[PDB]
């Protein structure tokens, strides 16, 4: 069940279907956006934390 | 207003095919269209110098790559 | 060299002046902005494309069913001029590959003193020395 | 006085303060993304999310007299915004001269000159200044140092008004002071041993503080004639009072109090003096202080709720016995979570949209049920305490009191100012 | 000069001394405002390097409107006898065009540095 | 539109074909253009008028 | 002025004074009073009546407050009046629209008595239903 | 209940929306914005309309890329002020400018989309065709003159 | 030869021994910039989907693009006098186009053109101060824009909640590189369909023009008041 399960939640939390020409898009809550506003960029601020967890230096 | 659509609808479904044969007869073959498309991109691929933007992204990425 | 260049600009601006009236085809990549999943679960249909489901593989001029309710020589002669342009750019780059090679026996000569320098390929390469032009 | 929690997708990697003299403060955050989020102080949520119009912003700067904002990019941009009335209103005027290296840290001299240390290991200068003919262009590009084989990152950036200087700590740790004018370097120290990310000072310049992820914070002083006539700096104490890093400190100086504040990816907090750093004493706040309530019990079945963000966990009192959660990520943020006498309904929290679930005890375990009353789904909300079981007290952000859960108003008074 | 509208800086104005010295180096740049311009019309330039310093600057400034509709990049350095001295003949000079092709020796520096001129404009 | 002009287009702004078939057959260029019947190179004598 | 805003009010929220106030439309404030007179009367006929003149002598809601008069109005002599009223073509059209018999003999009367003869000819295919146009010709 | 000013052609034009002070400031689109209702609504009053002329169009360019300093626009000002009513200012950048006088200036940008969509209706009483006319010849007389040199 | 109306009449198909897009003749006798006239009779200008931007979306196509033949057009657009007049060319006679720029090194070429077209109103101010071109324009009814300085959203959103209308339409050429640089297309255009749908646009379609020119897409958007 939980393979089936994990690939619902997929077809489910899924927006941009390719489906031949092109694909499309959804939107958003707009009042919600508003007052729980800031989305992060996850790949920057992993580069920034993994910069200073660097491989060079000890920490333990 | 009215959609009758008893014989109408088998009457404009017949005259969009045959307007939309008659409007596609005379655009393109597909027998060699294939060798024009490609004779179309390879021009278009010499008139923009797009290459030189991938290779600015590239130039423009690596700047910020921090060597680790 | 002095006329293989000018040759050179006259078949370019005859190149550029059979591109703009010159078409190309169309591919880029394309996206409808949707709502809800009451509407996306259903893709954009051939009904949202609003026409006869033949001319929709264009991204060209396209109708829909409103607007929308010589044999084979101009194809052929279509396709010549398309091999003149490219032809036209094939001369070009043999004969501008001529017009550098030319261009570099121009310039061979001017003044200045050099060892040779040559490289493992086999083309002679080119190193001066250097020093401020009086 | 306030917790402004979010959710999952969000951090708060930056922050400001502005308050223009005779009107209300605004704080101003950075999101992981290209936004800045000018929140309010009327309530605690955000009234712009503005869009500055490039890159991925770093860090953003104060303007002296709170009027600008210097706002640093990720594709090399430092963008400008200016605050033409107070809250709300932003409007931005100029995009300065632009590098391919990425910004990381701001800092105004005065109306005049902002400083950005970049991630290309140099520290530029540019001059954003109105009625003058050279504005939205850098002045001057000072150099660090780089490793052997590693590319270097100048991490944080301050001024020095009096001593007319700025402070640069990068990731070698080499503590630079360079001059203003002339736009040469002064002295350097290779003191700290790790990466430097934040240090602070006081009011005519006697001292600047310096921190990193050494987790230790070092002082230097400019204090006697000496130092003052030949503009000199000694590396004059250094503490290690911390458990993991730093990654930001700030200092404050009054007649009632001077004290400064330091915390890291440790989530403690610590107090020191300036004044007397080696000197004084050490003041450790605990990692938490809960004027935020995470955790509610109930006397019937013994059992106790423990929310986190977006979260909760209920379990009940043997030894034990683990019950049930819910992440319910439909709600984004949590705030007051609290379950009825006789157990049977609880309510978990958010700012705008609160739900309801009816919790049956089906023996081992809380078999859990939605209930969706819909003024209670759109009402603001921040405190539920449950007189009954069956009807709910509503608490307001706009000052009020409901009582819901059974098919209103509670009115409470005036306030001066 | 007001008018000369992207003039460069410290860092940027070394490294394109420095490139237009390797290809002077190795000789495929053209010295001058009306050799500039005839390779900004047979589009054999890469880019062009001008000089903020000239009197009056309208001798040089023709070349930027041609120029942005043949899409190329132009940079400003400060001084007509430093690029001059970059191009290494002794005389003070106004614009310089450096020229393409695709076996050189300074390729990627070029490409580098044509991406920093279009980072600012 | 003659601003944004090389300044030997504008030496020879004016010998159009005879430049063109001096070309075109591999011959020698001429050298006044329209200009020739400018004061200065009226005044010049020889092929320092050229110059 | 005063007083019609607040008969605007009023029609937002009698026949004697309803007459006295076709009487001051009678005599762009006439445009308003004519138009108030027009909401006296949606909201009656000897003010209505008076009306009728004081819109036949001289804006575009103010004509379709009309035909809401019209609409609201023995027919075929209150139609022999208006037809006499209306008959540009645009107001003859509409004024038609909403006695074809009176209509067409409007009409024919008008076409009897230099370049205006397809123009409100054509006002029949505009109004072309399945006895209207048959009828009236027949009865004009 | 106010007067609210526009620049149309090459006037100062006045027009009356018989509405509240505030209310009309206020609510501004669940007034019903349509031909008719607004047309009832904002109600002609006034047009300082100075000449067709190119020194006219000198007086308006000043008038209006500027603050305000016409004295056509002064004397359209010394036309509804004696009551201190509510006089709808167009302008933002000239509106310190506008309350500099003796008078009480004023989604009020939406009432002045509103004003905008209804004037070459009904409000001059002019035609579409021919207020476009007039921009087009005010855009290449004066506004490429006055830009350029 | 023969001549296509596509959904909006203005835009045609020139095709037959060469296929080719044109348009109509709000001004007969030449090609002002030095194309071909295909002739029917009836005159007929081809504009290239290179040098133009917004004949390429053509080559792109729409559901529902806002120019119409009576639709009046405003266009903020690039400094360049060029696509204006084949805006003009579609919407003929009856409607109108207001073409605003602000560097007048176009300026002067687009006052040459408008001059011959009086299909064409010329502001010649800024981008950003509609205030200040109040009195040159009343409710346009479409809106296009082609502007690269940075703050393409933000200032189109000021222009087209000041002088376009309700229910109307906005149509955009994203630029990637002229905004940001080192972040990809999709990316950055979401980022823009996101400021958009956040200024309430509602937007329709975006697609990227990818043969014609590099990263710069259009986007299409509803107007909600």
Redesign the interface.
Same mark, same amino acid.
């Given at each position: 069940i939980k393979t089936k399960k994990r690939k619902t939640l997929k077809n489910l939390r899924k927006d941009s279907v390719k489906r031949g020409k092109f694909r499309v898009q959804l939107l958003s809550t707009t009042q919600d956006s508003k007052t729980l506003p800031p989305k992060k960029e996850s790949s920057i601020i992993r580069s920034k934390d993994r910069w200073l967890n660097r491989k060079a230096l000890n920490k333990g | 207003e009215g959609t009758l659509t008893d014989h109408e609808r088998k009457y404009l479904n017949k005259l969009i095919k045959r307007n939309s044969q008659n409007l596609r007869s005379w655009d393109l073959e597909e027998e060699v269209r294939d060798e024009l498309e490609d004779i179309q991109q390879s021009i278009l691929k010499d008139t923009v110098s797009t290459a030189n933007t991938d290779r600015s992204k590239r130039r423009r990425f690596k700047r910020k790559q921090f060597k680790e | 060299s002095n006329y293989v260049r000018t040759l050179r600009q006259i078949e370019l601006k005859k190149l550029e002046k059979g591109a703009k009236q010159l078409m190309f085809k169309s591919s880029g990549n394309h996206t409808i902005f949707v709502d809800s999943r009451e509407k996306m679960n259903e893709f954009t249909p051939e009904k949202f494309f609003n026409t006869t489901s033949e001319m929709v593989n264009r991204s060209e001029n396209r109708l829909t069913k409103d607007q929308l309710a010589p044999k084979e020589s101009l194809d052929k002669k279509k396709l010549k001029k398309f091999k003149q342009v490219k032809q036209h750019l094939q001369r070009e780059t043999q004969l501008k590959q001529v017009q550098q090679r030319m261009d570099a026996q121009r310039e061979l000569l001017k003044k200045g003193s050099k060892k040779k320098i040559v490289d493992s390929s086999g083309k002679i390469s080119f190193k001066w020395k250097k020093q401020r032009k009086r | 006085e306030m917790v402004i929690e979010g959710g999952k997708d969000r951090s708060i990697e930056g922050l400001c303060w502005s308050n223009v003299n005779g009107e209300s403060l605004r704080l101003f955050s950075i999101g992981g993304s290209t936004v800045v989020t000018e929140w309010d102080l009327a309530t605690g949520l955000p009234l712009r999310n503005y869009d500055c119009n490039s890159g991925v912003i770093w860090s953003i700067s104060i303007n002296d007299s709170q009027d600008k904002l210097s706002v640093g990019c990720d594709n090399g941009t430092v963008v400008l915004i200016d605050i033409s009335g107070g809250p709300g209103v932003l409007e931005h005027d100029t995009i300065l001269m632009r590098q391919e290296a990425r910004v990381l840290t701001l800092a105004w001299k005065k109306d005049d000159f902002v400083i950005g240390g970049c991630s290309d290991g140099r520290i530029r200068i540019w001059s954003a200044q109105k009625n003058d003919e050279n504005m939205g262009r850098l002045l001057h590009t000072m150099k660090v140092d780089k490793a052997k084989k590693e590319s270097t990152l100048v991490w944080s950036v301050i001024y020095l008004p009096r001593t007319d200087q700025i402070a640069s700590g990068d990731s070698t740790g080499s503590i630079k002071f360079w001059d203003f004018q002339f736009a040469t370097l002064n002295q350097s120290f290779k003191a700290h041993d790790a990466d430097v990310l934040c240090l602070t000072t006081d009011t005519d310049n006697n001292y600047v503080f310096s921190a990193g992820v050494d987790r230790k914070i070092f002082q230097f002083s400019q204090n006697t004639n000496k130092s003052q006539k030949n503009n000199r700096w000694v590396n004059s104490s250094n503490r290690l009072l911390h458990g993991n890093d730093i990654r930001a400190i700030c200092a404050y100086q009054s007649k009632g109090a001077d004290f400064l504040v330091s915390g890291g990816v440790e989530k403690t907090l610590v107090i020191n003096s300036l004044t007397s750093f080696s000197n004084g004493n050490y003041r450790k706040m605990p990692t938490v202080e809960p004027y935020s309530k995470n955790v509610l019990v109930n006397k019937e079945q013994r059992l106790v709720v423990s929310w986190s963000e977006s979260t909760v966990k209920i379990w009940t009192m043997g030894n034990y016995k683990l019950v049930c959660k819910l992440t319910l990520k439909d709600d984004q943020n949590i705030s007051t979570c609290s379950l009825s006498p006789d157990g049977q309904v609880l309510v978990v929290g958010r700012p705008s949209t609160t739900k309801v679930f009816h919790l049956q005890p089906v023996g081992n375990k809380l078999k859990v049920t939605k209930l969706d009353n819909d003024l209670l789904l759109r009402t603001s909300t921040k405190l539920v305490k449950f007189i009954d079981n069956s009807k709910i007290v509503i608490c307001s952000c706009e000052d009020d009191v409901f009582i819901v859960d059974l098919e209103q108003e509670v009115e409470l008074l005036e306030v001066t100012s | 000069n007001p008018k000369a509208f992207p003039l460069a800086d410290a860092a940027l104005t070394q490294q394109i001394l420095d490139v237009v010295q390797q290809a002077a180096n190795l000789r495929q740049l053209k010295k001058g405002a009306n050799e500039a311009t005839k390779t900004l019309n047979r589009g054999i330039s890469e880019f062009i390097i001008m000089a903020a310093d000239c009197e009056p600057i309208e001798i040089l400034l023709h070349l930027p409107l041609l120029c942005e509709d043949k899409n190329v990049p132009y940079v400003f350095v400060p001084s007509r006898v430093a690029l001059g001295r970059a191009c290494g003949v002794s005389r003070p000079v106004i614009a310089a065009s450096i020229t393409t092709n695709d076996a050189s020796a300074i390729k990627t520096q070029i490409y580098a540095v044509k991406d920093k001129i279009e980072t600012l404009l | 539109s003659l601003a944004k002009s090389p300044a030997s287009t504008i030496q020879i702004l004016g010998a159009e074909k005879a430049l063109f078939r001096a070309l075109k057959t591999k011959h020698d260029t001429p050298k006044y253009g329209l200009l020739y019947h400018a004061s200065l190179v009226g005044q010049a004598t020889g092929k320092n008028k050229g110059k | 002025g005063g007083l019609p805003v607040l008969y605007a009010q009023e029609t937002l929220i009698y026949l004697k004074e309803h007459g006295c106030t076709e009487l001051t439309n009678v005599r762009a404030s006439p445009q308003v009073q004519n138009k108030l007179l027009l909401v006296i009367g949606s909201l009656e006929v000897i003010l209505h009546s008076v009306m009728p003149i004081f819109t036949f002598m001289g804006p575009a809601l103010i004509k379709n407050s009309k035909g809401n008069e019209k609409e609201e109005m023995h027919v075929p002599r209150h139609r022999r009046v208006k037809l006499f009223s209306t008959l540009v073509k645009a107001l003859g059209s509409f004024l038609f629209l909403i006695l074809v018999n009176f209509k067409i003999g409007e009409a024919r009367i008008l076409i009897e008595f230099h370049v205006n003869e397809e123009l409100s000819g054509l006002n029949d295919l505009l109004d072309i239903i399945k006895l209207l146009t048959s009828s009236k010709s027949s009865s004009e | 209940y106010v007067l609210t000013e526009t620049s149309a052609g090459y006037a100062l034009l006045k027009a009356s929306d018989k509405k509240i002070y505030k209310s009309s400031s206020l609510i501004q689109d669940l007034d019903s914005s349509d031909k008719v209702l607004k047309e009832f609504k904002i109600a002609a009053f006034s047009k300082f309309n100075s000449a067709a002329n190119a020194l006219e169009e000198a007086n308006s360019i000043i008038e209006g890329k500027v603050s305000s300093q016409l004295e056509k626009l002064l004397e359209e000002i010394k036309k509804d002020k004696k009551s201190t009513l509510i006089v709808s200012e167009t302008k933002l950048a000239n509106a310190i400018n506008k309350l500099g006088l003796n008078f009480n200036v004023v989604v009020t940008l939406d009432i002045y989309r509103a004003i905008k969509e209804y004037l070459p209706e009904l409000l001059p009483g002019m035609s579409d065709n021919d207020l476009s006319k007039m921009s087009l010849g005010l855009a290449h007389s004066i506004g490429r003159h006055k830009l350029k040199f | 030869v023969?001549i296509?109306?596509? #959904?909006h009449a203005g !835009?045609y &198909?020139a095709?037959?021994?060469?296929?080719?897009?044109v348009t109509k003749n709000m001004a007969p006798g030449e090609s002002v910039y030095?194309?071909?006239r295909i002739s029917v009779k009836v005159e007929y200008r !081809?504009w /290239?989907?290179?040098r133009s931007k917004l004949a390429?979306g &053509?080559?792109?196509?729409l @559901?529902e693009l806002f120019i119409a033949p009576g639709k009046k057009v405003l266009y903020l657009g690039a400094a360049s006098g060029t696509s204006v007049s084949h805006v003009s060319d579609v919407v003929g006679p009856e409607g109108?186009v207001y073409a605003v720029e602000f560097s007048? *090194?176009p300026?002067?070429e687009l &006052?040459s053109m408008?001059?011959k077209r009086?299909n064409? &109103?010329?502001?010649?101010?800024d981008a950003r101060?509609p +205030?200040?071109? #109040?009195?040159?324009?009343?409710?346009v009814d479409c809106v296009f824009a082609d502007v690269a300085q940075?703050?393409q959203?933000?200032i189109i959103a000021l222009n087209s909640?000041?002088?376009l209308? @309700?229910q109307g339409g906005v149509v955009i050429s994203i630029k990637a /590189?002229?905004? @940001?640089?080192? !972040?990809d297309a999709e990316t950055v255009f979401? *980022?823009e !369909?996101q400021?958009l749908?956040?200024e309430r646009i509602?937007?329709? $379609? +975006?697609?990227?023009? $990818?043969?014609? $020119? *590099?990263?710069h897409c259009i986007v299409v958007g509803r107007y909600m008041?």
């Open positions: - | - | - | - | - | - | - | - | 023969v296509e109306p596509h #959904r !835009v &198909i095709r037959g021994k060469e296929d080719l897009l030095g194309e071909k !081809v /290239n989907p290179f390429a &053509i080559m792109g196509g @559901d109108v007048h *090194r300026g002067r &006052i408008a001059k009086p064409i &109103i010329p502001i010649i101010e101060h +205030q200040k071109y #109040r009195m040159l324009i009343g409710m940075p703050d959203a933000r909640h000041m002088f209308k @309700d /590189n002229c905004i @940001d640089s080192t !972040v979401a *980022r !369909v400021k749908r956040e509602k937007p329709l $379609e +975006q697609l990227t023009l $990818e043969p014609y $020119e *590099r990263d008041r």
